[PDB]
Design a protein around this ligand. Structure first.
Ligand SMILES: Cc1csc(NC(=O)C2CCOCC2)n1
Ligand SMILES: Cc1csc(NC(=O)C2CCOCC2)n1
Lengths: 264, 265
């Protein structure tokens, strides 16, 4: 992978692995999300980060995901090369945004796109807070100045309000717990695991006859290593579902989302 | 990746990914096992397969893992390039063997090694069988003729008999279930998931102060997509050894048994 000519975006090629594909012999949405995260990490490393900036390290601040939105037109097959371009942009004092474009390396055609909203948080107290002047200044030298959006459309899917699922849920998968492979290098549950947990409550017949086209996920609270999660789904409709992840015990909400599936 | 000059082994380079590493910023044993599987699949593909031979597809036969043995000296760090060499060998009518050597691409030094035993099974009835002459002939053209072993030693730990853990277990992790990411392209639980499940019953303090040096795992029965597993561990021992058992939560049906050896950091 490498930064592009202007140094304002980053590109990387990936060959799809045997264990990375599902029943269709194409990359799962969890493999796609892992590839987005990997290209995002390689971009941060190439521009001097050791995700945190120098000012963030002094104030004990970290970037946390608030929203992830992914749209896939074609899933790459096992053995195929996918090229991913990523860039980041400041959104005033609200937070930051990271976008991606997925392309088939052979045809050069756009096969997917993604956008994510990130908010600033004190790592110890877990208190949100807004973006300061000092942080925006040392971030803007690595971001395009004019707006560059993976989802430019006025009033688009990536910026829609998501309602809270009402009990009873149509479908559910209960007692979901993270294992050590679900944790990152800081022993926190990886963001991609929540996508998998959301999808666990979709029935196997929908998965067998449909392909996931769009997934929008809001992150409300982090799931600890010793937490247990219940995954809830209701059909709202192509097939659309409304999703809710909550702690098995007290019912504390960890995520809410929507998925849109196309018939094969 | 590519077949070596003689066409009797296969090499591939991997750059270790951010999500592939643990608390030490080095590749987990599950990432290593996924890389072994990937290089093994790329080797089978490069020599004409899709690892069923021509006769195996006619007779509804598949290769299934009976044993996996992995020894790691150094885990590659995030961003490092690891080179893996793999080859297969016939073991008479018992089955086949697949071996691996892991090397640091920069220094060329051996950082790990692995060996695995595979048996032939009818896909439909699940009945294990000996290897026929016709199948043995079809895959011997892709294997070295002289023995080539990743674990050549006379008293190597890769061929040791593993006892059955006796209840009560010292440690346990209960109610483990596979999710869709744990399944392969044929909707069967991936072999690497069982390694993760075995390790789930090791206490977090052992993981925090030790590094896994050796893992030997026997596969007795497959875990179905809707099965629930219990992971059991007992200390048997500067080095710590554990005896492991995976069994179905309900009836206690054994799916795996294993041993791990950990060294102090
Ligand atoms: C160091 C760094 C910067 S961005 C990042 N992670 C991502 O972008 C992921 C998060 C969730 O999975 C998809 C994208 N890590
Ligand atoms: C095509 C083919 C033949 S065997 C194989 N994979 C392995 O060897 C893996 C199995 C899981 O444990 C790591 C090694 N792929």
């Amino acid at each position: 992978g490498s930064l592009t000519e202007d140094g304002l975006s980053y590109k990387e090629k990936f060959v799809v692995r045997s264990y990375e594909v599902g029943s269709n012999k194409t990359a799962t949405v969890e493999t796609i999300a892992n590839l987005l995260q990997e290209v995002g990490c390689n971009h941060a490393q190439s521009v001097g980060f050791s995700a945190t900036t120098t000012t963030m390290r002094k104030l004990h601040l970290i970037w946390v995901t608030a929203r992830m939105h992914i749209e896939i037109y074609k899933y790459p097959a096992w053995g195929d090369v996918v090229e991913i371009e990523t860039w980041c942009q400041s959104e005033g004092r609200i937070g930051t945004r990271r976008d991606w474009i997925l392309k088939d390396s052979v045809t050069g055609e756009v096969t997917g796109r993604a956008t994510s909203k990130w908010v600033m948080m004190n790592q110890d107290t877990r208190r949100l807070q807004k973006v300061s002047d000092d942080v925006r200044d040392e971030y803007l030298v690595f971001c395009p100045q004019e707006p560059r959006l993976a989802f430019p459309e006025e009033n688009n899917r990536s910026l829609k309000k998501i309602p809270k699922l009402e009990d009873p849920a149509q479908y559910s998968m209960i007692g979901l717990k993270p294992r050590r492979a679900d944790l990152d290098m800081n022993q926190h549950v990886n963001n991609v695991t929540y996508i998998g947990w959301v999808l666990e409550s979709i029935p196997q017949e929908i998965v067998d006859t449909h392909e996931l086209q769009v997934i929008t996920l809001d992150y409300r609270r982090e799931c600890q290593q010793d937490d247990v999660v219940d995954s809830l789904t209701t059909t709202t409709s192509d097939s659309q579902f409304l999703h809710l992840l909550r702690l098995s015990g007290d019912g504390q909400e960890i995520n809410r989302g929507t998925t849109l599936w196309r018939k094969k």
